[PDB]
Design a protein around this ligand. Structure first.
Ligand SMILES: *Cc1c(COP(=O)(O)O)cnc(C)c1O
Ligand SMILES: *Cc1c(COP(=O)(O)O)cnc(C)c1O
Lengths: 375, 375
């Protein structure tokens, strides 16, 4: 192999996909309940997306941000129209690049006011990216192992433990970074009470609330933005994964007053906001908005069916669900694979389900059927 | 606007490209000598690239590195074939993500060996990216302002000043990061003598040599990798931009021994190595190696014509050229634009030229004529 050994790849290779199914060279069909880790929001070979991309490829792939990028304005408008207040967007290429932008925006925001707030409070079991800024925010030392020193200023509180947050907070704290639901961390849900308090603290202590919606964003949980389940009012949010339906894209959306700190030359990206990614993003956002009622309906159904299995605690909401097992779930992933079902195991014993947002109840029953056979 | 104000965009809206030409919303035609900052290596609507991408879009966009990605193997193989020794590749989505991966690999490398080397020496006027790790390596304080503290351990020496390197090198130095030719910094060329000694220092002081080829890589300077002009032997190189011909992609290539340190779970990327990016890279790499002789010839032709204008010092190699003017080049960019020519101004007074690698002499003459009339 000419590739570095940083991944633990499953012994399977796909060549094509269509709808919620993937196929290997052998022609064997696989029901996809991982969607490339919540990236293939519209499944594979989605007609509207496929046709749009084929057209864009022949027209213009990239010109860079040296020039005006109208397509960025169009997509941004659709993202901001769903935000709780007036806001602006900066486009990136991935979730980690998006979190990086949010951290830089938060720090410069206070510096612009002549205030020395540069610290951040994130949470244990969180995952915000692998690049240095995002890695420092990621509350999992195992991922830090060998790369220290990280960016100074990051401390880790505990999810649903408001007291752990108060303890790490001081007058030098720029922001609090959190995932409404921690995906990679085991589909851990921040409670309404905790989130409500977290918001109050940010208003009270004058600290920015930064929500990482890279995994929960764009309809994944049953609302366009997961923060909307609790009427939260984030200062900045990070987005990626499902936003591009398979095409690499990322973005941060900040409220007007905060966005102002991203002045000319303060930050940028070469590939960021290229016409291909924005074309894909435009298709996805319009489609997810129409699918939301279905995502809520199919999601509730899927959660109910999981509870019926009586094989562990069911976590999450919408189509970001988990099944906490008593044993390590690594082996179940292999057994499901042999049976033509793609599932994921994270946090050691939590099966993570991230099917495409176009998933139907019939496909759900098919997946539940396999689970009942292997658990 | 719905976009943050972090860019200083020229008032031109492109909508389509064909060959080495771009067309804006008014249908006006522009000869592209910037190629989106050296990204559109094969120009726009390149037949072979377009057909390959359209075919890929219909089949598979993304599966994630949870599974085997054969397309990653194929592209890596082609990139390693041109490397000076045996190595491995890690795929990212941008140049900044690539430099970040390199910094991480270098630090973990020494940790695996039981050693305490975590510092890096980079150079003034260098540009390696905007995310925290890369931002720390970037030797331009103006890009740091408001974002500190950065990742600890970075110091900046002076290009072609070997003594400035010694004054910063100690036993805790993990590696030296450099651009063979600093593009963004003003197309600054590292001398053969300097690079020779720098290579010497690394071997004798036992420090890793990391060359950032995001801008110089993939044929831009006449050779597949710019370091080949000096028979250098880097431990790690970073690539991006032109590698994808317009599609976002990035990567680091490291010789076998260093690559070993990227163990399972140590690093990763959700979008990294997706089939769309790899299909693009595969086409570009095959086409570019066939263009190398052409790049060298048209490149030398262009450089000579630039010298003939007698309007400044000509810098660069191959098709990465610059013209250092007596005063700011801000206005000339606009004047050239008005005359249907896209050029770039960097380092305040350096006009940078990065035409597509398929550019021909007839096209060069066209650009030269415009330059003669405006300079
Ligand atoms: C997956 C994920 C990331 C990383 O996204 P990348 O595109 O791999 O950089 C960051 N934050 C959260 C919450 C994620 O789920
Ligand atoms: C352009 C450039 C980068 C940044 O690449 P991005 O994709 O914008 O992160 C890094 N290093 C060098 C040498 C570059 O020219």
């Amino acid at each position: 192999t000419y590739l570095m050994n940083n991944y633990a790849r499953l012994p399977v290779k796909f060549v094509r996909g269509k709808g919620v199914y993937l196929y290997d060279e052998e022609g064997k069909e696989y029901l996809d309940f991982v969607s490339g880790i919540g990236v293939n929001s519209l499944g594979h070979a989605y007609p509207k997306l496929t046709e749009a991309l084929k057209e864009q490829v022949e027209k213009l792939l990239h010109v860079s941000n040296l020039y005006e990028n109208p397509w960025q304005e169009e997509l941004a408008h659709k993202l901001v129209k769903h935000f709780w207040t007036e806001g602006k967007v900066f486009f990136a290429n991935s979730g980690t690049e998006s979190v990086e932008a949010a951290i830089k925006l938060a720090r410069k925001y206070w510096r612009d006011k002549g205030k020395n707030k540069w610290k951040f409070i994130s949470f244990e079991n969180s995952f915000h990216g692998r690049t240095y800024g995002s890695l420092s925010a990621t509350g999992q030392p195992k991922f830090h192992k060998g790369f220290e020193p990280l960016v100074p200023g990051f401390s880790y509180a505990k999810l649903n433990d408001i007291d752990s947050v108060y303890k790490l907070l001081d007058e030098e704290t720029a922001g609090i970074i959190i995932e409404v639901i921690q995906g990679e961390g085991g589909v851990n849900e921040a409670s309404e009470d905790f989130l409500s308090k977290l918001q109050e603290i940010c208003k009270e202590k004058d600290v920015l609330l930064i929500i990482d919606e890279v995994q929960t964003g764009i309809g994944r949980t049953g609302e366009f933005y997961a923060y909307q389940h609790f009427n939260l009012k984030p200062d900045v949010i990070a987005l990626a994964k499902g936003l591009g339906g398979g095409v690499p894209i990322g973005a941060i959306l900040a409220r007007e007053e905060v966005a102002q700190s991203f002045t000319p030359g303060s930050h940028g990206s070469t590939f960021g906001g290229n016409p291909l990614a924005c074309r894909a993003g435009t298709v996805v956002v319009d489609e997810v908005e129409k699918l939301l009622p279905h995502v809520r309906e199919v999601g509730n159904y899927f959660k109910e069916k999981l509870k019926e299995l009586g094989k562990g605690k069911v976590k999450g909401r919408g189509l970001m669900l988990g099944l906490e097992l008593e044993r390590e779930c690594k082996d179940y992933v292999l057994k499901a694979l042999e049976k033509g079902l793609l599932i994921n195991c994270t946090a050691g014993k939590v099966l993570r389900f991230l099917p495409p947002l176009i998933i139907q109840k019939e496909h759900i029953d098919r997946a539940i059927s396999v689970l009942r056979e292997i658990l």
